[PDB]
Structure 1
Amino acid sequence: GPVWRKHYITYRINNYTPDMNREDVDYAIRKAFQVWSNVTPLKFSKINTGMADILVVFARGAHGDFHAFDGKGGILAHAFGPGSGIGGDAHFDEDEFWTTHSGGTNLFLTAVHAIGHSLGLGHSSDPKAVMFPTYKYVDINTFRLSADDIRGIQSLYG
């Protein structure tokens, strides 16, 4: 389905979770975009004003779409495929406790998955894939895209 038809993509962090230090939110999101720029021709840039392609939002409960969040647990985040307006945007449930580590829900790992959707990927049935729909903590020692994820993204880009 839909893909970005340009190589320079922008993102903006709409608001910041109080669960984390501001700089750690910025870094987690930046690093998550890097995972995907490493395996595609895409370039990602953070902007702080105006309309970005991919808006990163922390929100809880009903927050303006059909994908209302459900309090702590269950659904952690959701994202829209490429397109105008809400297309591309990535939403993170503030009722989770976001972190840089194994405690709570790791923001970086969740953002890698969400951004996969923001770039046009669907879910994988392979539990080893980052696009599998259940969160799995892995350290940034073992984390890597799986073959399934790589094939998926290169079938869309590059």
Structure 2
Amino acid sequence: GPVWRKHYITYRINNYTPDMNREDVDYAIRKAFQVWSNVTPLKFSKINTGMADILVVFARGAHGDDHAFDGKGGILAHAFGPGSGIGGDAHFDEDEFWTTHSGGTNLFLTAVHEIGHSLGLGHSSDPKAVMFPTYKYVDINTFRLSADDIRGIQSLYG
């Protein structure tokens, strides 16, 4: 599967969910990128204009890729593996209610998983892994990648 073949990766926040404070969306996305840069050689930088490697989008229903969202619940987000164009991009279902806490769907935890995909990771069968394809809230203040996540990302980078 594809990986980014460079060490400096850019992201851009296309638009902001009205569910959250702007600074909280910025911080959640920043902290989620940091989870992955903690365990690889990668460096992430937010850019404000122009083409980013990873475009972060909030959208509902049909949104121009061939992967429609389904309203509240069900699919929370999806992302594309490394590559040109839409490659790397992470889309968050605006029909969810995004939060900084245990209420609704936690943006940070969801973004960690999505950014895993943006970097080339697939799903894990281990319930403990952030890449396990089922959302279960865990306290984000003390979140940790599982050994499975670490093995997975280190098999792709570093």
Q: Decide: shared fold, TM above 0.5.
A: yes
Aligned to 1:136: 136
Q: Deviations over 1:75-134 (max 9, x none)?
A: 000000000000000000000000000000000000000000000000001111000000
Q: SS state of the match for residue 115, structure 1?
A: helix
Give the Cα separation in 2 of the matches to 1:113 and 1:77. Answer: 9
Q: SS state of the match for residue 156, structure 2?
A: coil
Structure 1, 99-108 or 135-144: larger mean CA deviation: 135-144
Give the Cα separation in 1 of the matches to 2:30 and 2:154. Answer: 20
Aligned-residue offset at 1:65:
1.2
Aligned-pair identity (%): 99
Q: Deviations over 1:125-150 (max 9, x none)?
A: 11110000001111124410001000
Which runs of no fewer than 5 residues in structure 2 stay unpaired?
none
What is the TM-score when the length of structure 1 is the normalising length? Answer: 0.99
Aligned to 2:14: 14
Aligned-residue offset at 1:66:
1.9
Give the Cα separation in 2 of the matches to 1:31 and 1:157. Answer: 19
1:62–1:141 CA distance, 2 compared to 1 (3 A):
same
Checking the alignment, whether the CA contact within 8 Å between 2:108 and 2:140 is kept in structure 1 is no
What is the TM-score when the length of structure 2 is the normalising length? Answer: 0.99
Checking the alignment, whether the CA contact within 8 Å between 2:129 and 2:148 is kept in structure 1 is yes
Deviation above 4 Å: which 4+ runs of structure 1? Answer: none
Which runs of no fewer than 5 residues in structure 1 stay unpaired?
none
Checking the alignment, whether the CA contact within 8 Å between 2:55 and 2:89 is kept in structure 1 is yes
